[PDB]
Symmetry: D2
C-alpha cells in the first residue's frame, strides 16, 4: 500500500528481538520490501516468529557479548540495524539485580550491537533504529528500570546520531504507545489515547521502513512517536 | 523512489505557503503521488511556484479570513491540509504590531485553516500537517515572534490531535532544521554546520518526503507527533 | 518560613493578573520579602485581590497598550516582572476572534510588558517570570488557544532569555499544575487526582514560593528554565 | 543571603559524591542551613572535601552494594538524599565494560541509594534530589554512556516521583549546565551560553536547598535547568 516493492532489495537488515511482537513485524516489513533480514531473539522458531523466505531466524541471547560479536563478524554486509529487543519485570525491577538485568538488555546490548554494526554500516552508509517508549517521557512507578532504560535509549540514539553522522549512518528511534503484542488500567490507557485503541505491531513497522530508507535522508537523532496521541492527552 | 505512485490518487490536498520553498516541494510531492493539490500563497505564479498539471496555483493572503473561508467552501473534497505558510521579520518582531503580524500568519491562520478544513477532512478522515521549527525547541533572540509562534503551532498540533481524533483526522508536525530555500553569512553558515551532525543544509524535498509519510496510511497510529527533519541539529 | 525577610527589600515588582489567584499570591510573597509590588489586573479591589501596605492595586486591562506603556513610564524603578495574567474561554476558543483574544492577553501582552519592563530591568539587572501551564506540554482539545498560547509563552521565555542575558535579565517560567484558584466536576477532579502523584490540588502560595526562588539571587545561573510546580502531574 | 539560617535544623542529609565539586557545595549548603550531612565519596578527606562541624566525611565506593546498605542501616534518621555521584570516561565509553561502569555508578547506585533511603525518608516524609545534565537532552558523541546514564536518571526521577509520592517523598532533579568544578570547545560552550560564563557549584547548591525544602512542597518529578540558558540557544 505505501512503499514500492523492492526499495530494500539487495540490503541486509538485522533486527534484535525479531522473534515476536514489534520485532517480528519489523522483520516482516523489511523482508516484504526486498531486504534479507536476520531476526535475532529468544525462542527464534516459536509461534510468533516471522516466516518468510528472506528472513533467517536465529536463536541468540544478545547479552552474550562474545556470541553477538561472532555473529556480526560473520555478516558479509549490513545496511540497517534495529535494536528492538526489550524486557520489563514490572515491580521486581525494585530489586537491584533485576533492575540491572533490564538495563543490560534494554540499553547495554543496544550499545554493543550498534558498535558491532558500525563498521558494516559505514561501508555504504546505512541506519540504526532504536525502540523507545512512552516511558522515555513519563515515569513508571511499576517499572522504574524499564523507564530508566528507555530514557537512556533516547539519549543513546541522540549520542550515536552525533558520532556516526561522519560515516553516513543515521540513528533514530520510534517511541511506540501501547501496542497490542487489568480492566481499570485498560480503561485509563484508552481514555488517554486520542485514537482510543491499541497500536498494532505493523504500524510501528511501517514507521521503521520509512525512517531507515532514503525518504528520511535528513532525519537523524529523531524520536518518532507512534502512539495514537497518548503523549498529548 | 520510496512511495507507491498512487498512494494519494483521487485525494485532494491543500498546501498553504505552496508558492515557494518547502510548501512548493510538499505540493509537488503530493501531486507526484496522485493527489490533486491546491497551492495557496503570495506571488502564486512566481519563479519558485510549483508547476504540475495536478497543482492549482492560487494567489491568496490567508490572513484574509473571509476569502479563505470562500475558498474552502468551494472545495468539494479535502483529504490533507498542510499549514506551511510561515514568516519571520527578525528583529522587527520586537515591535508589537509586527510581533502580532507574525503570530497572525504563523498561528492564527493555521487555526482558521484547520477549522475550515475540518468538516471536509471528517468526511473520510484525513490529516493535518503543520510546519514547526528548531525554534519550537530553542529560543531565538533575533526572532521572538517566530519562536513563540512555532511553540504555539506545536501545542496547537497536540490540541487539535486530541480534538480531531474522534473524526479520524490525524494532526502532526514536522520540525525542519535548516533547509536551503531561496546563507551568504559565512559565520552563520559555519555555526549552523558545526551544530548539524549531517554537516549540510537540508533540501525542501527531504521535508516533503516526511510529509508524504506522515499524511498517509503507513502513519495510521501517528497523531500529535512532531518529527524532526533536521540533520541531527536538535541533538548537538 | 524558607526565605530571609529582606531578600527583596528596596526592590520593585510588578505582577500582571495580580488581582486574584496565583498572581495575588505571588504579589503577597514578594511583598512579604520586602518588595514594593504593583498588582495589575481587572477588578483590582475585588474580594480576591491582595491586601498589604506594600502592594499597590491597579485596575488595568493590559491589552490597552498605550495605558500599559504610560504605567511603565511612570515607574522610577523595576527589578522583577511577573507575566501572570492569563485567560481561557474553553471551547469558545474554536471561534477565531476568541482564539485571538486569548492569544492577545496570554502572549502578546506578556511580550509588550517584557519590552516595556526591559529598560528598567536592565538598570541593575533583574528578572522576568512567565506563567506557563501543563498545556505547554499536553494539548487541550477543550482549549486550543490556551494551549497554543502557553506553548508560545515557553518559547517566548526561552527567546527573551537569550536576548536579555547580556543585560543581566534572567527570564524563566513556572508551569503550574492544577492549582485551586477561585472543581465541582466530580469526574474531572477524579481524573486529575488519579494523574497527580501528590493526589491533591496545588495551592497558590506554592507557586508563589517557587517564584520567589527563581527571581532571587539563589537562581543567578537559572535562565530560560521552566520549573514544573505540579504535584508530579507531568510524570504520570 | 537567600535562605533562613536554620531551615534544615535537626534534619539529616546524605550526599553521594560529597567529596568534591557539586556534591561538596551541596553538602556545605545543607550544613550551613542547619542539617547534619554525610558527605559520601572517594578521597573523602582530600583537598576538595567539605569541612564543617555538621558534615561527616565518609570514604565509600557506592558501587559496593553491601557496604552502602550497611551505611544506610546504621543511619538513625534521613530527611534528604542527594544522588550526586557521577563519572564520565569520555571516548573510552565506547568500550562496553567502561560503558557499563559509567551506568553502574551514574544510574544503578542512585537506584539502590534511593531504595535504601526510602524507609527512612518515609518516616516523616522527605526528598530525593538527583543530578542530571545537559546531556539528558543533547546527545554526546564523546560520552555516550554519560549521556545515556543522564537520560536514564531523568526517567528514574520521574518514576520514583510517582512511586514514592504516597510516602510523602518528593523526587526531583537539577540539570546543571557547564559547571566549573580545549580552547575551541570552551569558545563553543561560551558562545552557546546566554549568560556567557561557567556555572558555579554553589549555584547548583542553592537550587538543591530550595527543591528539598518546604517552599517546593508541590514540586515533584521536576527537572530544573541550572545552565545559564545553554538549553535555549
Ligand atoms: N508492546 C508495547 O506496547 C511497547 C510499547 C513501547 C515500547 N515497546 C518496545 O518494543 C520492543 C519490543 O517489544 P514487544 O512489545 O514486541 O515485546 P515482545 O515480548 O513481544 O518481544 C520481545 C522480543 O525481545 C526478545 N528478547 C528478550 N530478551 C532477549 C535477549 N536476552 N536476547 C535476545 N532477544 C531477547 C524476545 O525474544 C522477543 O523477540 C521492546 O524494546 C519494547 O520495550 C513496546
Ligand atoms: N527554511 C527553513 O530552513 C525552515 C526551517 C524550519 C521551518 N521552516 C518553516 O517552513 C515553512 C515554509 O517556509 P520556507 O522556508 O519554505 O519559506 P518561504 O519564504 O520560501 O515560503 C513562504 C511561503 O508562505 C507564503 N506566505 C507568506 N505570507 C503569506 C500570507 N499572508 N498568505 C498566504 N501565504 C503566505 C509565501 O507566499 C510562501 O509561499 C514556514 O512555516 C517556515 O517557518 C522553514
Ligand atoms: N489555576 C490553575 O490551575 C493554573 C494552572 C496552570 C497555569 N495557570 C496560569 O496562571 C495564571 C493565573 O491564573 P489564575 O488561575 O490565578 O486565574 P484567575 O482567573 O484567578 O486570575 C486571572 C488574573 O488575570 C487577570 N486578567 C485577566 N484578563 C486581564 C486583562 N485583560 N488585563 C489585565 N489583567 C487581566 C485577572 O484580573 C486576574 O487577576 C494564568 O496565566 C493561568 O493560565 C493557572
Ligand atoms: N561539572 C559539570 O559541569 C556538570 C554538569 C552537569 C552535570 N554534572 C553532574 O554533577 C555531579 C557531580 O559532578 P562534579 O562536576 O562535581 O564532578 P567531580 O568529579 O568534582 O565530583 C564527583 C564526585 O563523585 C564521587 N564519586 C565518583 N565515583 C564514585 C564511587 N564509585 N563511589 C562514591 N563516590 C564516587 C567523587 O569521589 C566525587 O566526590 C555528577 O553527577 C555530574 O554528572 C556536572
Amino acid at each position: 500500500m505505501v512503499f514500492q516493492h523492492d526499495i530494500y532489495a539487495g540490503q541486509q537488515v538485522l533486527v534484535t528481538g525479531g522473534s515476536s511482537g514489534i520485532g517480528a513485524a519489523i522483520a516482516m516489513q523489511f523482508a516484504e520490501l526486498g531486504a534479507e533480514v536476520v531476526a535475532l531473539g529468544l525462542d527464534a522458531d516459536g509461534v510468533h516468529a516471522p516466516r518468510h523466505p528472506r528472513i533467517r531466524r536465529e536463536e541468540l541471547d544478545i547479552t552474550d557479548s562474545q556470541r553477538l560479536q561472532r555473529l556480526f563478524e560473520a555478516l558479509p554486509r549490513l545496511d540497517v540495524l534495529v535494536n528492538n529487543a526489550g524486557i520489563s519485570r514490572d515491580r521486581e525491577e525494585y530489586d537491584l539485580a533485576t533492575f540491572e538485568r533490564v538495563l543490560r538488555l534494554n540499553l547495554s546490548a543496544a550499545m554493543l550491537a550498534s558498535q558491532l554494526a558500525r563498521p558494516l554500516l559505514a561501508q555504504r552508509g546505512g541506519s540504526i533504529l532504536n525502540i523507545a517508549s512512552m516511558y522515555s517521557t513519563f515515569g513508571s512507578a511499576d517499572r522504574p528500570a524499564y523507564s530508566a532504560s528507555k530514557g537512556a535509549i533516547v539519549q543513546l540514539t541522540r549520542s550515536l546520531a552525533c558520532e556516526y553522522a561522519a560515516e553516513r549512518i543515521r540513528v533514530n528511534a520510534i517511541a511506540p504507545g501501547w501496542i497490542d503484542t487489568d480492566v481499570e488500567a485498560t480503561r485509563r490507557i484508552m481514555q488517554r489515547t486520542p485514537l482510543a485503541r491499541w497500536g498494532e505491531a505493523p504500524e510501528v513497522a511501517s514507521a521503521a521502513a520509512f525512517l531507515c530508507g532514503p525518504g528520511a535522508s535528513f532525519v537523524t537523532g529523531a524520536v518518532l512517536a507512534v502512539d495514537g496521541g497518548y503523549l498529548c492527552a
